[PDB]
Specification:
This protein is mostly beta strands. Helices cover 9% and strands 34% of the residues. This is Thaumatin I. Keywords: Cytoplasmic vesicle, Disulfide bond, Signal, Taste-modifying protein.
Length: 207
């Protein structure tokens, strides 16, 4: 599996790719406006995620902090990044197929388009101005748009009991980005691609 992470934004983002307990390829890298970072994720990767970090500062030893997406203060993420983060989620080679999706379940910070390089499936997108129209109670001070579970930590927003319906906030994330998960039990917007496909994550795909 080969992922070409492009940064079409007007601003610099630090891309991160991680699996949860381990990194993917290097684990993270700076993407100045327009740069493209090609990486290899091992086939069979389950639950892998890719996201963007904004307003980062790293010392000469790969250690620092980011205002959104900070993954334990490292340039090469070995863990997931703290919200608000637009998530490009994917699980590879699962009984002969790949599965991809975009998730606002942890908020939104950067627009993105998750689409395949190979043939045989479509590509999800979430490229609206969510941070600009983010509700006040959700507006993340350091930029981005937090999810309701990060802000309120109620069993209903985090779906801790497996029983949970949509919410006003969830409906906000779903009204602007309908092709992306707005809450844990959303009607799945998952795309099924042929196993061993290649993809391309494009930040701000409309600049």
């Amino acid at each position: 599996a080969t992922f070409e992470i492009v940064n079409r934004c007007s601003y610099t983002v630090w891309a991160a790719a991680s699996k949860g307990d381990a990194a993917l390829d290097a684990g993270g890298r700076q993407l100045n406006s327009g740069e493209s970072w090609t990486i290899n994720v091992e086939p069979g990767t389950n639950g892998g995620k890719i996201w963007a970090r904004t307003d980062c500062y790293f010392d000469d030893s790969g250690s620092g902090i980011c205002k959104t997406g900070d993954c334990g203060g490292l340039l090469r993420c070995k863990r997931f990044g703290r919200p608000p983060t637009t998530l490009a989620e994917f699980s590879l080679n699962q009984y002969g197929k790949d599965y991809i999706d975009i998730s606002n379940i942890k908020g939104f910070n950067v627009p993105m388009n998750f689409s395949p390089t190979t043939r045989g499936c479509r590509g999800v997108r979430c490229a609206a101005d969510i941070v600009g129209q983010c509700p006040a109670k959700l507006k993340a001070p350091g930029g981005g748009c937090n999810d309701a579970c990060t802000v309120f930590q109620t069993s209903e927003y985090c779906c801790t009991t497996g029983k949970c319906g949509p919410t006003e906030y969830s409906r906000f994330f779903k009204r602007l980005c309908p092709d992306a998960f707005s809450y844990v039990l959303d009607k799945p917007t998952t795309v099924t691609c042929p196993g061993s496909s290649n993809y391309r994550v494009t930040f701000c795909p409309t600049a």
